[PDB]
Amino acid sequence: DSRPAAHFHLSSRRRHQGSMGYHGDMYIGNDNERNSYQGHFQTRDGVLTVTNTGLYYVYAQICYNNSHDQNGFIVFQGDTPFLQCLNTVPTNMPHKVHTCHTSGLIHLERNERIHLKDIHNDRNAVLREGNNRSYFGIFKV
Amino acid sequence: DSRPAAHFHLSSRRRHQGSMGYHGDMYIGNDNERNSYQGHFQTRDGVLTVTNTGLYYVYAQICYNNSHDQNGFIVFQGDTPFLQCLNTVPTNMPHKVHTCHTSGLIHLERNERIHLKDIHNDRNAVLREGNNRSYFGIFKV
Amino acid sequence: DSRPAAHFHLSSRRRHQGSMGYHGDMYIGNDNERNSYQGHFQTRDGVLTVTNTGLYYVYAQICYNNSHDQNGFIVFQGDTPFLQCLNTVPTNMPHKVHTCHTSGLIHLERNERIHLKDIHNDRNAVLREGNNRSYFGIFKV
Amino acid sequence: ESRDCHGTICHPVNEFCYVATERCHPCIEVCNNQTHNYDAFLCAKECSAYK
Amino acid sequence: ESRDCHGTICHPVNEFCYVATERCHPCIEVCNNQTHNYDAFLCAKECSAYK
Amino acid sequence: ESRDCHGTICHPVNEFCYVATERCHPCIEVCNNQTHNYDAFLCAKECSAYK
């Protein structure tokens, strides 16, 4: 039965142009098979819309697998960057794999939205069906 | 009084052979002295068993203190890897200390189980009584 | 309307001398504008005091931006280090930016306190109004 | 063109205001082909005057 | 013996499919005694044909 | 003065018990001006006898 809570497997990314110069790639999440939140959330194009005003706890994780020294992503409250994660992994070693995880409380009013965007463009991250390395979720407190 | 919530101090590890080639060491957690979850959880050999079906939020953290470039662990839902954390810390510097933290929502049916396993074998991590660097916990949402 | 939950933007730091040789800088957090917890929490000098006994979930994140190989902070339950986060970022590269995030369940009795302190002194971290890189929060479970 | 990066003025040709570090960053790190930090999009959008 | 690592075929003797990176990995990194990445269990189980 | 760092005895002049690693740490890493790990407070409080 439906509950305002959901776990999303990040399965793909889309090019996206933001409000205020945030042009990083938008992460797209697939429902876990046991998700059931009809009437509490709506999801389109990687944007999650909240049905009723409330206080929600959100967690987000991206697993990077590229050569770049700096990587990171942003959780947006509307068009405002609210939560963020960043990693620095130096040297030119090719085998760089690391998860970036963050979380926090976000007060969302009715019809307010959140979405997940990378800081960079075309950065390789682990994206796949049933992803157990990059995921994000939300539940009302 | 008992509540389906618990915080565990990771105090030791055991060699463990998994369902599908996951042969990393199993982490063993000790109860925090204020834990009280009689009738909600059961714990044996590092495996936590859920008494009633429900949606649970789990967090897990391991603090590594070894020389290896790559480290990480897995939270298992049954025998399926569900949550994961990975760190890359390069160079041959001897003083490598880092915490790997992840979390997520896990829908657990009655008698379903979760457990915590490292990706590698015989990797030094901080394990001790009342551990304040490696821990893991769970609570029903 | 007030609820035992709050999200804090870490806006400054203060020199602080601890119970048991913990002399790292104390982090000071500003309320998010939608915080409302009258009668549930009290905050002075970076110390949060809990009004009623209960089980609380806390999350903490500091975004470091300095040259040091090792960085980290501690969440204190009273004067006891309970939660911790640590990062190792090697080499002498000047552009080191990384978030350290941890969380856990803390059973707090009435009038018990928590506070956030760095492991080191005068380490540059991201501290500002409406901080979206270093923050910390709490809510009752 | 504004090189103001959190109060610090970047070099007009050799630097850009990097979003990740919130500091002025050398354009050579993202524009050089041999380096592991090569980023064609960043080099094109942030370091137009470089080289 | 299957060297298929997420579609990529590893070198039959000098590489193994590393669980951490989900990529083909050089056996010398885990089999060499001087390196800080030496892992006797990984070398024994993943790189039997190496050296 | 106790150099006992989790059972390991640090060098009386060249080492200190580092809180971050919970290991004995070389004083030169925090006392040297050229290094990126220079920490004046740590050097003054943990490595009084160094140099």
Author numbering:
A (entry chain A), B (entry chain A), C (entry chain A): 275 to 415
D (entry chain AAAA), E (entry chain AAAA), F (entry chain AAAA): 31 to 81
Text taken from the publication that reported this structure:
To shed light on the mechanism of Grnd activation by Egr, we set out to determine the crystallographic structure of the complex. To obtain diffraction-quality crystals, the Grnd30–97:Egr146–409 sample was subjected to limited proteolysis, yielding shorter constructs assigned by mass spectrometry to Egr269–409 and Grnd30–81, that still form complexes in solution according to SEC analysis. Grnd30–81:Egr269–409 crystals diffracted to a resolution of 2.02 Å and belonged to the P321 space group, reflecting the threefold symmetry axis observed in the complex. The final model includes residues 269–409 of Egr and amino acids 31–81 of Grnd. The architecture of the hetero-hexameric complex consists of a core Egr trimer bound to three Grnd-ECD copies positioned distally. No major conformational rearrangements of the Grnd fold can be observed upon binding to its ligand Egr (with a rmsd of 0.674 Å between the free and bound state), that associates as rigid bodies with no induced fit. Importantly, in the Egr:Grnd arrangement each copy of Grnd contacts two Egr protomers, implying that the trimeric state of the ligand is essential for the organisation of the high-affinity interaction surface with the receptor. The TNF domain of Egr adopts a typical “jelly-roll” fold, with an inner and an outer β-sheet composed of five antiparallel β-strands (conventionally named A’AHCF and B’BGDE, respectively). The interface between Egr and Grnd is organized in three surface patches. The modular interaction surface is provided mainly by the Grnd β-hairpin that snugly fits in between two TNF domains and the α1-α2 loop, strengthening the binding by His66-Asn67Grnd-mediated polar interactions.
The Drosophila tumour necrosis factor (TNF) ligand-receptor system consists of a unique ligand, Eiger (Egr), and two receptors, Grindelwald (Grnd) and Wengen (Wgn), and therefore provides a simple system for exploring the interplay between ligand and receptors, and the requirement for Grnd and Wgn in TNF/Egr-mediated processes. Here, we report the crystallographic structure of the extracellular domain (ECD) of Grnd in complex with Egr, a high-affinity hetero-hexameric assembly reminiscent of human TNF:TNFR complexes. Here we show that trimeric Egr ligands assemble in hetero-hexamers with both Grnd and Wgn, with Grnd displaying nanomolar binding affinity for Egr, which is 3-orders of magnitude higher than that for Wgn. Altogether, our data provide insight into ligand-mediated activation of Grnd and suggest that distinct affinities of TNF ligands for their receptors promote different and non-redundant cellular functions.
